[PDB]
Amino acid sequence: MFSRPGLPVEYLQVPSASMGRDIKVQFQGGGPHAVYLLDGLRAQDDYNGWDINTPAFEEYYQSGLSVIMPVGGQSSFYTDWYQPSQSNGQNYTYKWETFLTREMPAWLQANKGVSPTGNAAVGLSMSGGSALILAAYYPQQFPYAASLSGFLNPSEGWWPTLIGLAMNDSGGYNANSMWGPSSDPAWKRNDPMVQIPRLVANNTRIWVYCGNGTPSDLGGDNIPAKFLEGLTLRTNQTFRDTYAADGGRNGVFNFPPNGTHSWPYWNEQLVAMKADIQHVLNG
Ligand X SMILES: *[Se]c1ccccc1C(=O)N[C@]12C[C@H]3C[C@H](C[C@H](C3)C1)C2
Residues making contact with ligand X (CB under 6 A): 208, 210, 236-237, 240, 253-255
User: What angle separates helix 274-282 from helix 263-272, to the nearest 10 degrees?
Assistant: 40
Between 165 and 208, whose beta carbon lies closer to ligand X? 208
Residue 251 Cβ vs ligand X, minimum distance, rounded to whole Å = 9
Q: Out of 16, 125, 149, 216, pick the active-site residue.
A: 125
Residue 14 vs 208, nearer CB to ligand X: 208
42 marked ligand binding residue: yes
- Comparing every residue's Cβ against ligand X, the nearest one is 253
For residue 204, the minimal CB distance to ligand X (Å) is 16
Active site residue 156: no
Q: Which residues pair with 254 in a beta bridge?
A: 209
182 has catalytic annotation:
no
Tell me how far apart the alpha carbons of residues 56 and 48 are, in angstroms, rounded to a whole number. Answer: 11
Q: Any binding-site annotation on 7? A: no
- Residue from 33, 177, 182, 261 carrying the catalytic annotation: 261
What does each C-alpha distance from 44 to 40, 87, 170, 171 come to in angstroms?
Answer: 9, 18, 10, 10
Catalytic residue among 59, 63, 87, 229: 229
- Helices within the chain (DSSP H only): 49-53, 56-60, 96-98, 104-112, 126-137, 159-169, 175-179, 185-189, 196-201, 225-245, 263-272, 274-282
In the complex, minimum distance from the CB of residue 205 to ligand X, in angstroms, rounded to a whole number = 15
Residue 231 assigned ligand-binding role: yes
Nearer to ligand X, 47 or 253 (CB): 253
238 is in an annotated binding site: yes
- Nearer to ligand X by Cβ, of 70 and 150: the residue is 150
Buried b (16+ CB within 10 A) or exposed e, 108-121: beeebebbbebbbb
> Least CB distance from residue 249 to ligand X, whole Å?
13
Q: How far is CA 199 from CA 29, 123, 133, 196, in A?
A: 28, 16, 9, 5
Annotated binding site: which residue ranges? Answer: 41-42, 125, 153, 231-234, 238, 261-263
- Return the active site residues: 125, 229, 261
Annotated binding site for substrate: which residue ranges? Answer: 41-42, 125, 153, 231-234, 238, 261-263
